[PDB]
Design a binder for this molecule. Sequence first.
Ligand SMILES: Fc1ccccc1-n1cc(-c2ccncc2OCC2CCNCC2)cn1
Length: 305
Amino acid sequence: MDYDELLKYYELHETIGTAKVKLACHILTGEMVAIKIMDKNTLGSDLPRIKTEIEALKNLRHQHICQLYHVLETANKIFMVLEYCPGGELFDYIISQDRLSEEETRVVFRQIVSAVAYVHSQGYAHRDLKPENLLFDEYHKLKLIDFGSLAYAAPELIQGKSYLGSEADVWSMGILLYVLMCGFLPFDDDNVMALYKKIMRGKYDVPKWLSPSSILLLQQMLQVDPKKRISMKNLLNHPWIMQDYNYPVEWQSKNPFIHLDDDCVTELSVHHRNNRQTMEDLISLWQYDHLTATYLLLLAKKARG
Ligand SMILES: Fc1ccccc1-n1cc(-c2ccncc2OCC2CCNCC2)cn1
């Protein structure tokens, strides 16, 4: 029952994560995708919250956000077809490299900043930023996933205090910045209570390989008082961020909802019995059905060249 409708559009390959994640092939275009499979019965009470997260993803379209292509709902399952990221997790990348240089950290950090600033510009907050939530695509560009961990959580978030998601994101970004340049967490312990004490105290070791500017940026992000944390606006053109670039982080989306690609509308129209204008009208509704999937995948096929 569960897989019948999905199997009309996708050829399923192997599981890569357990929500379960499967690699698949889009039949029409031949494009690889990742399929997030969610058991509705397993979620039960947390199900309406997963539905609000899907709706938020429908409103996020960005070069550094893993793209939603298709949402399929059955009696027992929710399927989310997503952008294929074969480079894997930034978590695995950090471990394989041990730690990144200041220069390579900047390449990756400016991409995280671009995604997160855009998420905030859309009225959302991520709240679970960590290197397991950042994937590399075939072009080695980062893609943010799993919208909506203890080692990355802001002191106020752990204490159960009221918080602004934007300030909790800036703290988690400070933790990511440290891990990128150090290869280990600033706050860590085998005991959960001792880790909780360490986060709230906000004291961490400053390794010898960190430059004075890196150290100052970490201080500006890793403030226990959320009001003392740097705002996203000042992070876009921060002196550490501008070093070797001399231009602020481009956070604005390059992936439109409005403008449609004429080649992709043309390619798409041959598979349907409608005229071009009807086709453009249908695509513009952005229903996250097979039509949305096909259009976005043709665009991804085109960008490859
Ligand atoms: F990760 C990959 C490796 C090789 C080929 C493709 C991928 N890929 C994963 C996704 C993906 C997209 C949206 N949400 C979750 C996703 O994966 C979660 C798993 C959890 C276990 N670790 C690996 C990533 C997209 N492409």
